[PDB]
C-alpha cells in the first residue's frame, strides 16, 4: 500500500529465470521514410531542432541474439510504419512484413517476444490534427491501434507492454522541452498527457483481458521508469520524508493509478489540488489492477540530464536493490520485470566498454541480492541495449547497446562489445578462486607482527607499552624501523647519538627476553616524515649520489652496534613507493646503490661475525586486467608488475640491470615524444655491484589492483607505464578502498618463484584497515582468507614461503586504523584470531 515503502530507509539466480535484451524502434530500426512510412513526432523533432538500419538488417540482428543466447527480445512496433496516420485502416504492405518475419524467426529460435506498442514514436498526424495526448480522443485511437496488434500479432506474442516509461513522455515532452514534441514549461499539458497515458493503458488492458487473453493466454503490463534517492542525513526524518515524496512524484504518479488503488497518490493530489485532473470514482474501479506484472525501467533516461528528476535537496543513488524493495512494499509485493537496465558509454568507447562490465556487475549483484536475500519476486532481466543507436536528444554522442555498430560503415556490422561476452557468460552460467586448503604450516614458519618508525632498559616509557603489546601475540618475530635522522642528525659519522643507539639496543634486548627475534629496518620513508637527515635533504636529498654513500656509513654504524642480537636486516622498507614522493629513476638509482653498499658492507665485514641475513622489502601488490576481454589490459597487467616489482628485483636478484621490459617500453613512449624521460643505462661495473645483493625475498603485499590500458599524457613516472586503475564496488573493499582480494598473494608468490628462481620468500607487511576498534570483523576475514592463500601456495605450488608479518601492531589518533591495537593500546579482537592461526600453524 501507499506510504509503506518509506520504511526502506530505516549466488545463482532462480531456475527458469528470463534472461533477455531489448531495444526500441526509433533508435535501432532506421529508414524513417522507406516503404511508405509515416513521419513520427521525433522525425519532425530531429529534422527541425542514417542509423543502425535494423529495418533491413534483421538477419544480422538475429545472429547477435544467438551470440548472447537470450530467452526473450524486447522490441517496439513503430506506429507510423504500420498506419501512417494512426487511424486503423490497412497496415503498410512492407511494414507488416518486417514485424511478421521478425516475430516468426524469434519463435523459430525459441525466443519468446516481448512487444511494446508505444515507444515515443507517435504519428505526426495525431499530434498536428488532434494534438497528441493533450486531446483525449487519442485514448480510443491507441486502443484501436492496440486491437490490430492483438489480432495479427497476438498469436505469436504472449507478453505485451503498452507505454514504455510514460513519465518521460509527459515530463520531458511537455515540461522540459527535451523530448518530442518539445514544449518547455506547460504545467497544464504535462499532467493532462500523464492523465491520458494512464487512461490509454487501462483501455488497452481491459481490451486484451476480455477480448484476446482467453484464446491467446498471455500477459500485459506497462514499463514504468524511476530513479533512486538517498537522504542527506540518515538520522534526519524530514530528509527521509523528502525522499518518499520524490519517488512518489516520479514513480507513484503512474503506479498508484495502475498498481495501487486506481487514483493518484495522496501527496500528489494535495500538492497539485487544482492542476492534477480528477479520476471519477467510476474510473478508479476500471483502472486499479490493470497490470498482470510490473515492468520496471532503471536506466540513464531517469538520471540524465539533471532536470529529469526533483531531488528535493537529497542525494541521488543508483542502488537497484533498495529500488525494488520500495516497489515490493508500496505495491503489495508484485512480480517485477526489469524491462530496461544498464548505463551508457561515450562515443569514443568503440568496443572496449570496460565500465559496462562493472556497471552490469553491480546491477545483477543487486538483483540477485533482491531475489535471494530480500525476497523480491523478480522473474526477468532486460539488458539495454542490444546494439548502439540513436539515443534521443543525445543523438549518437553516447552508446548504450551491447553491440558496437559503426554508423559511418555501409555494412553496419554488429561487432560484440566487451559487455556482450560478459553478459553471455552470465546467461550461460545463469549467475576465479579456490576453496580451503586444510593443512598445517611448517614448524619453522616465522609468525611476525610489524611496527613503523619508532622515534625515541625498562626505564624507557614507550618501550614498556610496546612490550606489553607483544605479549598477547604468539608471534615469533617483530618488524620495526629506525629513525635515520635521529642517530645521525648531521648526516655524518662525526655526530653519533649514542643515546638513540642505546634506546634501540634496549628494544631488541628486551625482545630477546620475550623471545621475539627482531628484524630491523634502517630506512623507512613515508609522506609524514621523509627520514633523510636535514643536511642531506638540504643537499638535494636522494637526488645526490652522496646520500647513498651516507647510507653505507649509517648502515655499518647500526651493523656493528646492533648485529650482536639482530640476525635479520631490511635496508629500505618499500623503496618502490618513492615515486609518489626521470627525476624519480635517478632517485631510485641511488636507492638501489645504497642497498648494495649497505649489503656489501655486511656480506664482507659483518656477515662472519654476526651470522645473519640482509635484504629489502618491496611493494608487492598483485595486478590483474580490468577487462579480461580486452587484450590491452592483459599486456599492461605485467607491465605494472615490471614497473613495480622488477624495477627493484632484476638488478638486486638476477641480472643487475633494470628490467628490459620496463627499459624498452619507456623508450617507445619517448620515440614519438610522449615522454621526455629515459631510464638510465647501467655499465658493467654498476650491474656487477647490484647483482645478487639479497639473502631472501621480502614483499609488502596488501591488496590487488585492476590495471587497464590508456595512453596517459605527461612525462612523469605514472605516464611512463600507460596504466589506469579501476575500483570494483562489487568486491569487498575497505574503508580506504583496499579491495579485499585473497587470491592475489598466491598469484604473486607464484609470479616471484617463476621469475626469480627458488629462493626464500618473506611476507613482511600484510594488513587491512577497519573502522571497528573492538571487533574488526573485516581484518579477521582479511587475515583468515589471506592466510588461507599462502598455505595453498606452500602445500600445492611448493613456494618457499617462510614468514608472515601483519602490517601494523598499533595505529595513531588521526592515522588510518591499520593496527591490531587501539590508539590507547587496547587489544582488538584481531589479536586472538591471529593467535588461533599461529597456535594451529594454519588450518588443519
Amino acid at each position: 500500500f501507499s506510504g509503506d515503502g518509506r520504511a526502506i530507509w530505516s549466488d545463482t539466480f532462480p531456475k527458469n529465470f528470463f534472461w533477455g535484451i531489448g531495444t526500441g524502434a526509433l533508435q535501432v530500426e532506421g529508414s524513417w521514410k522507406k516503404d511508405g512510412k509515416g513521419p513520427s513526432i521525433w522525425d519532425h523533432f530531429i529534422h527541425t531542432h542514417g542509423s543502425s538500419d535494423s529495418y533491413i538488417f534483421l538477419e544480422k540482428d538475429l545472429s547477435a541474439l544467438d551470440f548472447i543466447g537470450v530467452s526473450f527480445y524486447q522490441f517496439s512496433i513503430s506506429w507510423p510504419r504500420l498506419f501512417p496516420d494512426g487511424i486503423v485502416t490497412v497496415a503498410n504492405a512492407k511494414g507488416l512484413q518486417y514485424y511478421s518475419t521478425l516475430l516468426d524467426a524469434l519463435v523459430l529460435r525459441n525466443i519468446e517476444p516481448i512487444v511494446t506498442l508505444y515507444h515515443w514514436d507517435l504519428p505526426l498526424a495525431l499530434q498536428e490534427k488532434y494534438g497528441g495526448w493533450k486531446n483525449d480522443t487519442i485514448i480510443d485511437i491507441f486502443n484501436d491501434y492496440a486491437t490490430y496488434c492483438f489480432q495479427m500479432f497476438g498469436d505469436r506474442v504472449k507478453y505485451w507492454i503498452t507505454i514504455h516509461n510514460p513519465y518521460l513522455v509527459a515530463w520531458h515532452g511537455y515540461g522540459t522541452g527535451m523530448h518530442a514534441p518539445g514544449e518547455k514549461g506547460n504545467l497544464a499539458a504535462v499532467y493532462t498527457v500523464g492523465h491520458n497515458l494512464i487512461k490509454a493503458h487501462s483501455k488497452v488492458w481491459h481490451n486484451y483481458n476480455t477480448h484476446f487473453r482467453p484464446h491467446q493466454k498471455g500477459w500485459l503490463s506497462i514499463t514504468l521508469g524511476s530513479h533512486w534517492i538517498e537522504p542527506q542525513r540518515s538520522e534526519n526524518t524530514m530528509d527521509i520524508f523528502k525522499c518518499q515524496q520524490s519517488m512518489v512524484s516520479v514513480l507513484g504518479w503512474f503506479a498508484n493509478p495502475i498498481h495501487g488503488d486506481g487514483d493518484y497518490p495522496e501527496g500528489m493530489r494535495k500538492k497539485l489540488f487544482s492542476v492534477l485532473p480528477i479520476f471519477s470514482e467510476a474510473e478508479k474501479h476500471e483502472m486499479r489492477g490493470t497490470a498482470d506484472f510490473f515492468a520496471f525501467s532503471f536506466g540513464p533516461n531517469n538520471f540524465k540530464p539533471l532536470n529529469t528528476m526533483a531531488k528535493m535537496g537529497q542525494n541521488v543513488s543508483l542502488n537497484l536493490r533498495e529500488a525494488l524493495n520500495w516497489i515490493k512494499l508500496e505495491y503489495n509485493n508484485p512480480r517485477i520485470l526489469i524491462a530496461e537496465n544498464g548505463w551508457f558509454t561515450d562515443s569514443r568507447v568503440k568496443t572496449e566498454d570496460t565500465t559496462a562490465i562493472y556497471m552490469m556487475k553491480n546491477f545483477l549483484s543487486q538483483v540477485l541480492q533482491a531475489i535471494r536475500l530480500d525476497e523480491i519476486r523478480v522473474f526477468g532481466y532486460t539488458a539495454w541495449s542490444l546494439l548502439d543507436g540513436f539515443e534521443w536528444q543525445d543523438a549518437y554522442t553516447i552508446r548504450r547497446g551491447l553491440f558496437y555498430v559503426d554508423f559511418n560503415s555501409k555494412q553496419k556490422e554488429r561487432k560484440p562489445k566487451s559487455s556482450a561476452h560478459y553478459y553471455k557468460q552470465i546467461i550461460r552460467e545463469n549467475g576465479e578462486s579456490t576453496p580451503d586448503v586444510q593443512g598445517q604450516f611448517p614448524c619453522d614458519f616465522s609468525w611476525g607482527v610489524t611496527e613503523s618508525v619508532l622515534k625515541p632498559c625498562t626505564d624507557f616509557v614507550n618501550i614498556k607499552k610496546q612490550l606489553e603489546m607483544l605479549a598477547r601475540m604468539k608471534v615469533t618475530h617483530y618488524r620495526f624501523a629506525l629513525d635515520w635522522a635521529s642517530v645521525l642528525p648531521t648526516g655524518q659519522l662525526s655526530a653519533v647519538n649514542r643515546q638513540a643507539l642505546r634506546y634501540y639496543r634496549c628494544v631488541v634486548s628486551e625482545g630477546l627476553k620475550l623471545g621475539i627475534s627482531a628484524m630491523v629496518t634502517l630506512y623507512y620513508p613515508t609522506h609524514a616524515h621523509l627520514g633523510l637527515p636535514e643536511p642531506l635533504l638540504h643537499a638535494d636529498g636522494w637526488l645526490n649520489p652522496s646520500t647513498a654513500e651516507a647510507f653505507q656509513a649509517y648502515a655499518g654504524l647500526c651493523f656493528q652496534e646492533l648485529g650482536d642480537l639482530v640476525k635479520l636486516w631490511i635496508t629500505i622498507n618499500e623503496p618502490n613507493r618513492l615515486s609518489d614522493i626521470n627525476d624519480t629513476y635517478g632517485a631510485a638509482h641511488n636507492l638501489l646503490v645504497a642497498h648494495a653498499l649497505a649489503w656489501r658492507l655486511y656480506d664482507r665485514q659483518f656477515r662472519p661475525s654476526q651470522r645473519g641475513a640482509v635484504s629489502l622489502s618491496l611493494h608487492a601488490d598483485w595486478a590483474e586486467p580490468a577487462n579480461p576481454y580486452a587484450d590491452s589490459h592483459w599486456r599492461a597487467a605485467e607491465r605494472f608488475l615490471q614497473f613495480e616489482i622488477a624495477w627493484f628485483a632484476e638488478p638486486l636478484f638476477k641480472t643487475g640491470d633494470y628490467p628490459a621490459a620496463m627499459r624498452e617500453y619507456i623508450a617507445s613512449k619517448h620515440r614519438r615524444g610522449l615522454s621526455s624521460s629515459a631510464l638510465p643505462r647501467l655499465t658493467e661495473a654498476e650491474r656487477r655491484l647490484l647483482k645478487g645483493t639479497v639473502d631472501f625475498c621480502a614483499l609488502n603485499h596488501f591488496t590487488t589492483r585492476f590495471v587497464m590500458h590508456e595512453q596517459l599524457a605527461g612525462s612523469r613516472y605514472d605516464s611512463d607505464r600507460d596504466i589506469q586503475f579501476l575500483q570494483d564496488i562489487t568486491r569487498l573493499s575497505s574503508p580506504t578502498r583496499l579491495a579485499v582480494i585473497p587470491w592475489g598473494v598466491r598469484k604473486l608468490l607464484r609470479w616471484v618463484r617463476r621469475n626469480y628462481g627458488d629462493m626464500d620468500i618473506y611476507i613482511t607487511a600484510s594488513g587491512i584497515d577497519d573502522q571497528a576498534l573492538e571487533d574488526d570483523r573485516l581484518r579477521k576475514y582479511y587475515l583468515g582468507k589471506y592466510l588461507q592463500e599462502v598455505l595453498k601456495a606452500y602445500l600445492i605450488d611448493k613456494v618457499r614461503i617462510k614468514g608472515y608479518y601483519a602490517f601494523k601492531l598499533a595505529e595513531e589518533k588521526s592515522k588510518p586504523r591499520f593496527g591490531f591495537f587501539t590508539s590507547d593500546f587496547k587489544a582488538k579482537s584481531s589479536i586472538q584470531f591471529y593467535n588461533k592461526v599461529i597456535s594451529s600453524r594454519g588450518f588443519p
Partner: nanobody
Framework: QVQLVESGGGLVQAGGSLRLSCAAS????????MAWFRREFVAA???????YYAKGRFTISRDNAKNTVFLQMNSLKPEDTAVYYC????????????????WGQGTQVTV
C-alpha cells in the same frame, strides 16, 4: 631478456597448409605483442584477441599457456614462398618493422 625459437618448415605444393609456431622463452613475455613477418608484415596478435592481418587465409593465434604463437597458413599461394620470422614489440600499440625489439631465426617456406 627474451628469445624466440621460430620453428617450423615449409616445402609443399600450391594450395597446401602449414602450421608455423614460434617458441617464446625469455622474461616477461606476456607484456609483449608478437607478430610474423615475411621484409613484409604478415600478421600480429596483441596477447590473445587483437589480430591484425594484411587476410582470410592466415590465422594468427597465441596459446599463452604454452608460450607459443602460431600462424596457420591455409590455401598457400606460390607468391607466399619466402622466409617467415616472428617478432615481439613493446606492449602498447604499428608494424613498420621498427616497433619490434626482439626477432627470431626464421623458418623456410616454399610453394
Amino acid at each position: 631478456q627474451v628469445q624466440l625459437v621460430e620453428s617450423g618448415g615449409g616445402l609443399v605444393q600450391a594450395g597446401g597448409s602449414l602450421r608455423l609456431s614460434c617458441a617464446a622463452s625469455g622474461r616477461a613475455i606476456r607484456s609483449y605483442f608478437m607478430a610474423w613477418f615475411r621484409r613484409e608484415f604478415v600478421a600480429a596478435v596483441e596477447y590473445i584477441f587483437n589480430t591484425y592481418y594484411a587476410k582470410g587465409r592466415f590465422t594468427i593465434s597465441r596459446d599463452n599457456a604454452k608460450n607459443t604463437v602460431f600462424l596457420q597458413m591455409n590455401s598457400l599461394k606460390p607468391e607466399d614462398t619466402a622466409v617467415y620470422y616472428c617478432a615481439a614489440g613493446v606492449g602498447a600499440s604499428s608494424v613498420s618493422e621498427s616497433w619490434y625489439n626482439y626477432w627470431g631465426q626464421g623458418t623456410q617456406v616454399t610453394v
